[PDB]
Amino acid sequence: NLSFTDQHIKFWKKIPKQKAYSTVEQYGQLLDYGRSQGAFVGEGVLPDTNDS
C-alpha cells in the first residue's frame, strides 16, 4: 500500500461528536447583558430599565 492510512487523519478524530434528531438543529445564545446607559443615579431617584 503506497497511499495514506488512517493514522494521517487528525481533525476528524478530535472534534466532539453529538447525535442529531432532525435535519434542522436549533440553539440559543446570550450576546449581551444590557445596553450601556450609565448606572449613576441621584439620591431617591428611580433607575432606568435595561434589557439584555
Binding site: 445596553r35 450601556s36 431617584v45 428611580l46
Partner: protein, 171 residues
C-alpha cells in the same frame, strides 16, 4: 418651545379629573416682553408647563435607532403632533327625569369639563438652571408611574420659624 417631552400615562392616571387624556406633554419655553414701538425687549422669562393634549396631525422626523437596532442612512419615521384641547368628557352617575320604571331610573351621563394645566411656573431671566431642574424633576416624576405630587418651591414660601405669624389658623 426649547424642550418637549411626550409621556404615556396608564389607566389609573387617565381616570383622574386632571388627567383626561392618554398622553401628557411637558415643555419649557422662553417668553419676552417688547415695547410697542420696535423690538426693544424689556424682560425675559422661562415657563414650565404640563398639559393634557390631543392628536391633531402627523409629521416626518428622522429615525433614531437604539443599540440593538441599526438604521439606514436616510431612514425617516412618522410621529403625531399634539395640541391643547378645550373640553374633555367624563361620565358621572345621574338620574333620569322622565323615567318610567325601576329599570331606567339610574343612568350614566356625560359631562364636559374645562381643561387646566397641571403645572405652571415662571422663572426670571437668570436661574435657567432652576427651571431646567424643575422640568427634569417633573418629567422624572411622571416617569415614576404615578401622578404629579410635588410642587414645593423654596423661593415662593413663607418664612419658617416665625411663630408670631404661623400661629393663625390654616387647616
Amino acid at each position: 418651545m426649547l424642550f418637549k417631552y411626550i409621556h404615556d400615562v396608564n389607566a389609573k392616571v387617565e381616570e383622574g379629573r386632571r388627567y383626561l387624556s392618554d398622553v401628557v406633554r411637558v415643555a419649557l419655553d422662553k417668553e419676552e416682553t417688547t415695547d410697542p414701538d420696535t423690538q426693544e425687549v424689556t424682560s425675559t422669562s422661562y415657563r414650565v408647563t404640563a398639559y393634557p393634549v390631543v392628536q391633531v396631525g402627523e409629521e416626518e422626523v428622522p429615525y433614531i435607532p437604539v443599540h440593538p437596532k441599526t438604521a439606514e442612512p436616510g431612514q425617516k419615521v412618522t410621529v403625531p403632533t399634539y395640541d391643547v384641547p378645550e373640553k374633555l368628557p367624563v361620565l358621572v352617575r345621574g338620574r333620569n327625569p322622565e323615567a318610567t320604571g325601576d329599570y331606567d331610573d339610574h343612568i350614566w351621563v356625560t359631562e364636559e369639563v374645562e381643561v387646566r394645566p397641571l403645572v405652571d411656573e415662571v422663572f426670571k431671566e437668570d436661574e435657567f438652571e432652576k427651571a431646567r431642574l424643575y422640568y427634569e424633576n417633573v418629567a422624572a416624576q411622571l416617569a415614576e408611574g404615578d401622578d404629579i405630587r410635588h410642587y414645593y418651591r423654596k423661593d415662593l414660601d413663607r418664612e419658617a420659624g416665625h411663630y408670631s405669624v404661623s400661629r393663625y389658623p390654616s387647616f
